[PDB]
Structures are given as C-alpha cells and as structure tokens.
Design a protein around this ligand. Structure first.
Ligand code: 1AI
Ligand code: 1AI
Ligand code: PRO
Ligand code: PRO
Ligand code: SR
Ligand code: SR
Ligand code: SR
Ligand code: SR
Ligand code: SR
Ligand code: SR
Ligand code: ZN
Ligand code: ZN
Lengths: 481, 485
C-alpha cells in the first residue's frame, strides 16, 4: 500500500478496495464490480437483516425494475426531486419503443399500484414486503465505490398499515435494525435522528436516518433511511380499506418505506481501514482466521497436517477459516496478502511451535502476537475474535465522541467545522435559513439529522444561528460524503 | 375459486392460477410481472439448493454491473448480432438525451470477460468460477407469458474459465446434471438432456447443452436451462490469456463456459402439476408443506383447547423439520382457508375438528390426489412424513408417464406432422442443416415445429446410412422436434 490514509485519502480508498480484491473497475463511469470478497460482506448483512425483518412479519418478494412514463407522474412531489436522477430506456435495438420506460430509482410507484389491488378490506392489512435488488440514481457527482454509485444494491421494505400508530412503531423498529447492522455487525457507531424539511424524502411526512462519521475526511454520511409516508402515497394510488366495525366507512392506508444500500461496506472500509489495508470486523469477515505455515526450509508433512488440524478444529466450532498452503509464495508474502484483505486473526504455525503444542495468533487491528496452547485453540480464538469486534467499535466510538461537539454561535460553528468535526447547533429549521448556512460555510455544510437524544438540552427562548428566527432544536451539521 | 378449466382454455386457466395463488401480479408494462412472496419462496428454495451445489465446485458468488458499453458488446461480433434486436438501451437522463447510449444486459458475457482478462495473467490465476443472481432484460416483441416468456426475469449465470479444455467440457455436464436435479429431485419434473442444434445454439460459442420439458396441456415443449461451452471464441476476443507454466513467453487462451437458470422453472412447475383446483407444489420446494386449519366452528372453553391442540401439532411437526404453518386467524372462515391454501398448492391440509380432538383423531388431506385420510394423534410425525414423500413421487410418476406417452419416434415427414398434430413431440433423423430446420418449421405449420434438443441418449440409435426427413442429406442424429414456447 503506497498511499496513506491521513494524507491522500481518495487514492488510499481506491488502492484498498482493489488490492483487497473487493472492487474491480468497469468501463461505464459510475459502475463497479462487487468481487466475492466484498460480496460475502453483503450476504452477511442480508442473512442478518432478513432474519430480523421476517420476525416482524415482513416477507421477501421482487417487483419489476421498469416504470412506465404515466406511473412516474402519479405522485407529483415524488417525481420532482427524482426527475433529473432517473434513467430512461427508449428503444430495444434499433426499434423505438411505444413509450419511454424508466429504470427504478425507487419502487414506490411500482408497488403501490399493486398495493391498491391487494388492499380491499381491514383484513388485508398489514402488508409488509421487502426485496433485495438494484436501483439506478443518475447523479452528476463524483462516483466512488459503495459510497456514491449510479447503480448500487440495496433492500427496500414497503409496509402499509391501517393506523398511524402501528406505522409509526415500525419506522423506529426498522431504524433500530439499521443501527444494529452498523454497530453490531460493522462495529460503526451511528447517530439516530430525523431529517430536515429540505433533506427529507419527497412527498413523505418525515424521514428518520442514521449518520455515520469518517474521521479521515471529517465528513459524515447517511447509512440508512426509514420514512413515514403517512397517507400521502395512499391518497394518490387509492390504497383504501373498509372499517371493520363501522359499516361503509373507508379509510386511507398509512405507509412506510425504508432502505439500506451497499455503502455499509464503504463506511466499514473508511472507519476501520489503515495504511496496511482493509480491516474486517470478525462479525462480517468472510474469513476470520487464516492459517499460514511458517519456517519452511523433511518433517514438513507434519506441519501441513497440523495446519489441517487447526482448520478442521475451527470449522466444528463454526469459525470461518482459510488455510493458505501455497508453495508458490513465501510466508512473508502471505502475511502481506491477507493483511490487505482484512482477515482479523492470523494463525502462524512454526516447526518448533508444532512440536511444542502452541501457535501464534496475530491480531489484524493492533498487530499483537499472542502465543496460545494447542488445547485452547477454539476457546482463545473465539475470545480474541470477540475482542477485536469490540476494540474496533470502541476506537470508532472514541473518534465519534470526540469529533462531535456543540456550538451556539456562527463563527464558533464555522471554526470547529473547519477543524474536521461535525457540530450540533441550535437551528430554526427553515429551508431559506439552511441554504444560507451552506452558502457561508464555504463544499458548504449541509444538515445531517435532528438527533433524537442531543448532547445538550436546548435552552427555551434561544435563537437560531441565523439570529432572526427562534431555534426549534439542535441539528447535527457537517459536510457530507 | 377458479373461473377457468385447464382443458378448456389453458391461457385463462394459467392467469387464474398464478394470481389466485398470489404468485403473479400484473405490471403496467406488458411482459413485466410481479413476483409475490409465494412465488419468490419457490425461487428461494431453488436458490438454497443450487447455491450449495455450486459452492462445492469452487464457484463463488459476486455481482457485476447491469450496463454494458457499446465497445465491449461489439468485441465478439457473433454474440452481439444475435442479441442486438432485444437489447434495451438507456438513452435519456431526465429529459436530456445522452451523448452515448448505454445498454442493459441481456447476458453478462461482454461485462464480466473484460474483467477476466485483467485478472488472468498467470496459470495459478485459473480456474475462475464466478456466479451471480440478478435480473436480465430481453425485450423481445413476441407474445409474453408469466414465468415462461418474460421481458425481465430473475436468474443465475455462472461463468467459468479453465486452462485446459477437459475441465471445461467436464463442468458443462456437471452443471447440466445439477439443472436436471433441480427439475427432477425438487420440482418433480422429468427432463431430457441433449445438445442444441447449430440454429438454436449460443451464437459465438462452441456447443450448447440444454434440458427440455414437456407440457401435456398444450403439447408444447420448453427449454428449462442451458449450459454452453464457449471454448476460446470469447477469450480470443477479450484477450483472456495466461502464461504457459513451462514454455517461456508462450501465452495460451483460456477455455470458458457459461450456464443459466431462470425463474421459468416455476412456470414449468405450475403448467405441469397444476390442476383445475389451483396450484400443486412439490414437497421439496414447498414453502409450507402442511397447514394447520382449525375447523368445526359453541363451547369457547373447548374452542380455546382446539387452538391449543393446533399449536401442539405445529410444535410437534417442527421437530421433524416438516415445514408447518398454523392458520389460527380468527378473521377468516375455515371454509375460506380450505380453498385458499388449496389454491396455493400446500401438499397436506391438517384439519382438526372438535370431535376429532376429543377422540385422538385428525384428518390429513393430500393435494395431489385429494385423499381424505383420518390419522390418530400418534403417527402425526411419521404418517405426514410418509405422505410428503409419497406426494413427491406421485407427482413425478404422472409427469414421467406423460412424457413417455407423447415422446415418440418418426422416420418420415409424413409420420412427422401426423403425430405432431396429436399434441406430441417426436424424435426424427435430422441432417443438422439450418436450412432444413427452417423448412421443417414452415411445412409442419401448413404453429411451426422447432428443434428442441439432440438427446444424448435417444429413444433409438440411428441406423447406419439413415436419411433425414428432408431426403436430400444424410441424417447425423436423432433430434427432438415439436412446438415450443
Ligand atoms: C450521490 C451520487 C453520486 C454519484 C453517482 C450516484 C449517486 C447516487 N447514489 C447514491 O446516493 C448511493 N450510491 C451507492 C449506495 N448508496 C447510495 N445512496 C444511499 C442511500 C440511498 C437510499 C436509501 C438509503 C441509502 C443509504
Ligand atoms: C421468449 C420471449 C417472448 C416474449 C418476451 C420475452 C421473451 C424472452 N424471455 C425469455 O427468454 C425468458 N423469460 C423468462 C424466463 N426465462 C427466459 N428464458 C429462458 C432461459 C434463458 C437463459 C437461460 C436459461 C433459460 C431457461
Ligand atoms: O428511496 C428511498 O429512500 C426509500 C427507502 C427505500 C424505498 N424508498
Ligand atoms: O444467456 C445465456 O443463455 C448464457 C447462460 C448464462 C450466461 N449466458
Ligand atoms: Sr366518511
Ligand atoms: Sr375516513
Ligand atoms: Sr473458488
Ligand atoms: Sr506462440
Ligand atoms: Sr498459444
Ligand atoms: Sr445433398
Ligand atoms: Zn435559522
Ligand atoms: Zn434434412
């Protein structure tokens, strides 16, 4: 690895995702190849998230990718902010189609016409559906793998309820699931809050989000969204049901939508990566422990059989293990090779170590070498793997606890912002006031989220940073990624 | 209920079954359809089986971009010219025309193999075995059918690259056998293995092996999956070269394969095993093998014990890994739940009446035969298990017999069209020419019979010196002919 993280971060990120065999560059700008090393992280998120949403009653399905030109113009506010971001298919071959067809930037306009046919009574509720698919967002910003891409994989769960109470209860349920994915699988602490009126989902009531922080660039990034659509989309697609007790009364449905993309892997690379390469948390690592024979220079057949000893012993306790037993490369090459890929534990077996009933476990995060007896293999490695997961989170929590501050004035909010930090400021919550913030912070700082539990309680009567309107709440501000 | 009959109008019967079973919902755009969770669970059941089998062969999962460039598609010329009229093109961002239209993938050959060239440099960089589960757009202007003939479908596509051609030719038949296991062991659908003719083969590749199924209701056959050996025709155009391990400087081209399996599997399952009373699911891919339905609806205290007895059955059937659901919904009638789960094709319906609860009795109803057999509260773990395996074999026996009745052999063009108009598929001696294959489709329609596959094990060996049905060229093999979807 030639680039450093504190110096050239952009070139460091490109070398890390490629040398770790996670990302391969295509030739259409905005598209990237998810190699099996990075795809195994996405499946680990799928098998965890799917097991949680199916407890809540959500069922997986799949909807068409194509949207007709008439279906996109059904919800006016939904097509406003999405019009410049949508890609249209106008012909197949050299034959122009009947009507231009769009690729889905989101499946709200595709499913809700079907929700209207399925919802006809109170018994046909609640509907809870989810799908793992791909979407196209034709944005004119600089693409970066995982983080910002035109095409990306995600999940989108759409749920219609008969009451606003049960709909509001699922919004916070899904948002806390997204928090578990970042904190308990990726070891990334995030801040849960609400979006402002300018950066909320178009055509919806309110948007909840989780904001992760990257100390290498001093920028924050949104990791997931969970919107409460209210009756906005159900009033335009005629998603109504009959009241169970009152005869003849028909009430509109209350709908929610929530999503989580593959930038979860990107934030993991940005938060835990170092100048030695990738760093995978043991919870999502494709290979947790790699076994490498050392000191090879004819008693070698026993050393290989002893590496196969640790390999099968770790498989029975259900620990993802890989045995690199290639004779083409030196043990020093394998050390560099698997450190770039982020394998949490390196299991070194030497000739004298084998005959001594001991081995060496090297931690990817700290580089510490711990000699472990042969009998304690399954139990000590299970303890170090759990310790690496927490260590990556505590160190990430320390960088988030110290880079998030409070500022009540504009110049002190401006000063701390240029020091690579995100700030919570008393904010009035107006669009015309937020545009001025991004105009004077310059690249300019945008709103991140209105945190549920802010760092400090807002003083009653305290004004906003603009000095003209009274402040409504503390809003986390900063530059986005 | 069901407003159509399978023998009367199969087209309307197909629309009623796929929708009333809550599998397919129609989309605003023709040719595109919605995969509801009941149909998606059938595809997920195929996924967990086929994924674990290719994992044992060294294949790893990944995901490639859905957009292909105009330069990469025009590399292999024979491949693009055959796919060109069905390639959806992205030509607009918002209300602005792009300076260079990009295409949506109808297959990921021209997308992955450029990356295969960068990865393959040494001999140890082989073999590369990569698979991906994704959707594919093939915007054909022909008559669309749900599952069977859709413009967008979910599928899997594995792309392998080997150093020697022996391992490549070996894996083609390995994947082809896995496709047969998906249809025979799981879907209980008998398939015939064979190679595709030069007309129906994969353009730009070497040879194409495929599986074929028969639908007795329409008398038409259908392709269930393909496994193409690409040879070096693709590695030569994308420069996928590896240095020779012994000969210094000399670089060799890699032998490649490609295989795909689509969601058409579900449509073939519904077309073959579906009856006039709804869907019929094989117990292997059954999302719900047995359904507990509390029937008999007075005594609310005993009625609570009836729901309690339902949970005991659902709790005991889980210990034997029998997929069970207890429909304890107090907002639906038991008669509603009967035909509702019958339309979904649940293999067994476990009904429990109040008199049966107070007498060590319960009734199990088979979906394939409709046998209402009363079983005691003792063999609930063994009898239902014996029925589930008896349902799987019975469905496969009816379909394997239907194939033997309608797959015959004819040696003259006269006997060809006669048995073809009887709703059967026929194995004929064929010369293998593209022009002769086009003449067969035109003559047998005056609706045209197409070549299905060249069976590896035909019904009869070609007699030495046999002539084709055309009479102008010697026959090379027996080919399965018949009308197709
Ligand atoms: C901003 C930009 C710049 C250049 C090109 C394209 C794009 C657009 N693409 C995205 O915003 C993006 N890309 C990958 C993964 N997640 C994403 N959204 C993030 C996202 C979207 C929806 C729900 C939840 C989340 C976390
Ligand atoms: C023929 C037609 C008519 C009208 C509109 C569109 C289409 C095209 N549709 C397909 O080719 C299709 N559709 C769904 C499932 N499998 C498919 N191919 C079948 C298939 C392809 C590749 C590998 C394996 C299989 C079994
Ligand atoms: O696009 C979005 O942001 C929401 C969440 C997933 C579905 N729609
Ligand atoms: O499209 C096809 O038919 C082949 C098989 C999967 C990849 N390409
Ligand atoms: Sr009213
Ligand atoms: Sr009302
Ligand atoms: Sr492999
Ligand atoms: Sr040469
Ligand atoms: Sr050569
Ligand atoms: Sr001749
Ligand atoms: Zn203000
Ligand atoms: Zn001929």
């Amino acid at each position: 690895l030639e680039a450093k993280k504190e110096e050239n971060l952009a070139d460091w990120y490109s070398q890390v995702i490629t040398k770790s065999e996670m990302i391969e560059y295509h030739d259409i700008s905005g598209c990237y190849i998810l190699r099996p090393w990075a795809y195994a992280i996405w499946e680990a998120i799928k098998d965890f998230f799917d097991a949680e949403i199916k407890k809540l009653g959500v069922e997986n399905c799949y909807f068409p990718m194509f949207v007709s030109q008439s279906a996109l113009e059904k919800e006016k506010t939904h097509v406003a902010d999405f019009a410049p971001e949508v890609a249209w298919v106008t012909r197949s071959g050299k034959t122009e189609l009947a009507e231009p067809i769009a690729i889905r930037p989101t499946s709200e306009t595709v499913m809700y016409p079907a929700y209207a046919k399925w919802v006809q009574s109170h018994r046909d509720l609640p509907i809870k559906l989810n799908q793992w698919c791909n979407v196209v967002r034709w944005e004119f910003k600089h693409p970066q793998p995982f983080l910002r891409t035109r095409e990306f994989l995600w999940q989108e769960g759409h749920s219609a309820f008969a009451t606003m109470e049960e709909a509001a209860e699922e919004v916070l349920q899904i948002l806390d699931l997204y928090a578990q994915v970042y904190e308990e699988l990726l070891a990334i602490p995030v801040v849960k809050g609400r979006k402002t009126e300018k950066e909320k989902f178009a055509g919806g009531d309110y948007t909840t989000t989780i904001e992760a922080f990257i100390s290498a660039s001093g920028r924050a990034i949104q990791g997931g969204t969970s919107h409460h659509l209210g009756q906005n989309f159900s009033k335009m697609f005629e998603i109504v049901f009959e009241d169970p007790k009152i005869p003849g009364e028909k009430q509109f449905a209350y709908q929610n939508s929530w999503g989580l993309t593959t930038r979860t892997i990107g934030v993991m690379t940005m938060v835990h990566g170092d100048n030695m390469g990738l760093v995978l948390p043991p919870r999502v690592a494709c290979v947790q422990v790699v076994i490498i024979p050392c000191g090879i220079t004819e008693d070698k057949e026993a050393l290989i059989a002893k590496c196969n000893d640790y390999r099968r012993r770790l498989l029975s306790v259900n620990i993802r293990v890989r045995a690199d037993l290639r004779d083409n490369y030196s043990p020093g090459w394998k050390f560099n090779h698997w450190e770039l890929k982020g394998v949490p534990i390196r299991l070194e077996v030497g000739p004298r170590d084998m005959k001594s009933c001991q081995f060496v476990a090297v931690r990817r995060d700290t580089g510490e070498k711990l000699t472990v007896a042969e009998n304690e293999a399954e139990t000590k490695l299970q303890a170090i793997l759990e310790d690496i997961q927490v260590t990556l989170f505590t160190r990430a929590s320390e960088d988030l606890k110290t880079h998030m501050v409070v500022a009540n004035t504009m110049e002190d909010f401006q000063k701390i912002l240029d020091s690579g930090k995100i700030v919570q400021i008393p904010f009035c919550g107006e669009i015309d006031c937020e545009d001025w913030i991004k105009k004077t912070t310059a690249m300019g700082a945008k709103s991140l989220c209105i945190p549920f539990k802010p760092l400090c309680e807002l003083q009653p009567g305290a004004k906003c940073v603009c000095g003209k309107n009274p402040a409504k709440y503390y809003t986390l501000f900063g530059r986005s990624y």
